[PDB]
Structure 1
């Protein structure tokens, strides 16, 4: 699985250990092994949400399966929760796009997972 966060929040407000925490939580939440979890955080971004430049995030989670109605609802609670608690971002200023990737459309290590 792959999680990317884009946010106008400053670099200095991203706590040390945020990436490891995202890794550990996403592992538990998706049921996938941490070695396969990647996380990416892009602060200091020039963005707006609903015309306002108060703290916000635009994120995405890609996975081969482990993506669906119930699962996505659950991930939103978890991840908005973490963006709220660690980055002080209100959950009504967060979008997260989910992508159920086909195994043939994910490369890793000189091949694909198909």
Structure 2
């Protein structure tokens, strides 16, 4: 699984250990081993949500399976929780796009996951 967060919150507001916390929590939520979890945080972005430049985040979670109605609700509660607690971003200023990737459409280690 891969999780990306783009945000206008400044780099100095991202706590040390945030990458690790995301890795651990997503391993738990997805059921996948942490060795397969990739995380990417992009602060200091030039962005707006609803026309406002108050703190916000635009995110993606890609995973081979483990994506669906109930699961995505649960991921959204988890991830909005983390972004609120760690980055002080209001859950109503967060979008998370979920992608259920076909194994054949993810490249890794000179091949695909198919």
Equivalents in 2 of 1:111, 1:53: separation in Å?
41
Equivalents in 2 of 1:50, 1:69: separation in Å?
25
Partner of 1:19: 19
Partner of 1:109: 109
Partner of 2:85: 85
Equivalents in 1 of 2:48, 2:28: separation in Å?
32
Could you tell me which runs of 5 or more consecutive residues in structure 1 were left unpaired when the two chains were aligned.
none
After TM superposition, give the deviation of residue 51 of structure 1 in Å. 0.5
After TM superposition, give the deviation of residue 53 of structure 1 in Å. 0.3
Partner of 1:99: 99
Deviations 1:55-107 (A, max 9, x none): 00000000000000000000000000000000000000000000000000000
Deviations 1:27-54 (A, max 9, x none): 0000000000000000000000000000
Equivalents in 1 of 2:51, 2:108: separation in Å?
38
Equivalents in 2 of 1:28, 1:6: separation in Å?
22
Could you tell me which runs of 5 or more consecutive residues in structure 2 were left unpaired when the two chains were aligned.
none
SS of 1:15's partner is: coil
